Subunit: 275 residues, 3 copies
């Protein structure tokens, strides 16, 4: 499979904060194309992201990132004068680094991992209104050499929803058996959830992939996750289990009974699927 | 101590789903011998389990397993036509594999670990009624060479109970000091808990046992656990601390005050115990 | 930086359990000097702590420790006759050990890690009243060679508070950029929280510091934590991000909106701070 190259490229992005139908709010790559979740931002350790944020909501809003290197001017908080007025723009800057030894001989871990960005100013100074209405999105930082997937699926447990949907309206994620599928799982709001996937499992380490014979991490198919936890992993879809309608859901019983579930549909190469 | 041999044996089991007193429901190895939790199923990586499930309840019920390899026909869900009608039988098939390198050079983790099985169809399509009334049990998959215990104790945090009991009616687990005791800890229902044992600790890795001088995992005596989390570990009972009445309990304060506690009784070789 | 020496020293401590203003209760090193949290107790693997506990409250109270080696006589519970009457004293004894191979060839993990002590008898037999009013404190056990910090900050999520404060009255932690800052994070009471720090991150292993090129643990800046979880980590303050008002807070939205937040103030060497 394809592996990430060395990082160290300065990359420019624009995000638009747009109103969506029914009082929702989303980040978008073009005006009028906001989605919930926001677009996935992917980079490799050592890259820099210059992200111009265009605020087309009616309230001051912001952009806050987990995991990455940013100074207080990109903190995304009113407290650090880091918000965006309606109709105005602002550039937020995310740096990353790769792991390495400090002068004093101790190791600095790298930025690589599964992270996320969200609003930190709509509703409350902690972004509670903005997050509730959909202002959140995934971030993937690769380490040089990390294995790369064919499909990326984002699951955000936001209160009692997946990606602001419940019911049967939760996203279905389609893949062909044998494809390298990468899940990114972020939680938001006021509740704790357990993420679970039928028919698949992963390693509870940085990448979700076994690192080698001396990797000692738990292999799991269920993970407790609270507001602003983020993790991710990669699976071979259908490995050892075949195609089919493979449920993903929150395993808290009343939550899944209230629609915190969807389908990971693994299909044969011709599109067929048992069911 | 005794270590697990190489796996790769096809093993046949029967489980009976029986009504228990007071509206409860349990899995059993013989009719009339259902227990809460259900019998512990233990196997070694590479084994296959053929489990004929006999449904002696008055409602369609099922058998769903975490961690192991199963196709959609053993998914245990109505959605995948994998339930058992009253008075009927069905065989569910669990495979396992050991870790190994794929053709594309990346590592497939093995099935080894602490897992569980439960109903996925009584009450709701997520098995909420079945789980509430006791349809759940432990699964242990060994890696070749794993150290084996002398005693196995199962603790299921099910809502505000341990193994569907509270009060002083929670299980007491007896061992002799120096015995290798293995705990299997599963959570179910609608709440998050913290498992804790007085006088003992363990490594937060696959086996709960330190793997070697380069094992880096946290050593802990408390663990947050949500619905369908499962983990396990092994301790030398009384190691560094001696015999006694050693509390295990949920460390959420209102929970332990409402009876989410029991006793790990470590005794001298002659049966004595301080207290 | 300075590294912990070999342990194996017997050390004597006295703690006073005192009433504090407004119905609170705290551990103190001198009468009249109780604090919430209680004083931080630090030791190195192999050390023994003899802690005389002086009970100056009006109710029987105790001292219970996580992680360390103690027999039932220092269990801290009424059940094991391990409480302290008003106006009376008692010595509790904590042992520790370093990792090592048992006669049967399997590894015993060491005591090193981030732990805590609290009352186990005020209010309920699980110390619910004592913990609520502030009877809790940090414990750090070093492994020989562990890197040592310049500043130690303790954050206890106790119900909907930090260190029994909310509002703007939560502790501010000051450091100079480049200082080795160590956080100790303990949770208590009835709720689950997610700890998060703006501008900083850490490794989810024993020490919170990357152990080396084969360290595989997740790098994170958010952690789910439930009652009596304890973890800790070390950061270079301002590393990659500079001085400033760096929020720490619970990331559960309603919690941070209800004041579960404070400031990690990183300043330049002359005391300046952006903001
Ligand atoms: Cu924040
Ligand atoms: Cu949930
Ligand atoms: Cu955040
Ligand atoms: Cu399910
Ligand atoms: Cu509990
Ligand atoms: Cu399940
Ligand atoms: Cu206790
Ligand atoms: Cu909180
Ligand atoms: Cu405790």
């Amino acid at each position: 499979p394809a592996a990430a190259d060395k990082g160290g490229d300065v990359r420019n992005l624009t995000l638009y904060m747009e109103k969506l139908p029914n009082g929702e709010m989303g980040y978008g790559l073009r005006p009028g194309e906001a989605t919930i979740p926001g677009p996935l931002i992917e980079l490799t350790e050592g890259d820099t992201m210059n992200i111009e944020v265009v605020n087309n909501l009616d309230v001051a809003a912001s952009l806050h990132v987990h995991g990455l290197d940013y100074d207080v001017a990109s903190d995304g908080t009113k407290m650090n004068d880091s918000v965006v007025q309606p109709g105005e723009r602002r550039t937020y800057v995310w740096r990353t680094h790769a792991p390495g030894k400090r002068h004093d001989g101790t190791w600095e871990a790298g930025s690589a991992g599964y992270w996320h960005y969200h609003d930190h100013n709509v509703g409350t100074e902690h972004g509670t209104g903005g997050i509730k209405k959909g202002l959140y999105g995934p971030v993937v930082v690769r380490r040089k050499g990390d294995v790369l997937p064919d499909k990326q699926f984002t699951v955000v447990f936001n209160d009692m929803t997946i990606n602001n949907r419940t019911a049967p309206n939760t996203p279905m994620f389609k893949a062909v058996r044998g494809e390298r599928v990468e899940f990114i799982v972020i939680t938001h709001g006021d509740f704790f959830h357990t993420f679970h996937v039928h028919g698949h499992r992963w390693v509870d380490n940085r990448t979700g992939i076994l690192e080698g014979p001396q990797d000692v991490s738990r292999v799991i198919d269920t993970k407790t996750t609270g507001p602003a936890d983020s993790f991710g992993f990669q699976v071979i879809a259908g490995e050892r289990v075949g195609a089919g309608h493979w449920m993903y859901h929150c395993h808290v019983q009343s939550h899944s009974d209230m629609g915190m579930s969807g389908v990971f549909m693994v299909t044969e190469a011709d599109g067929s699927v048992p069911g």
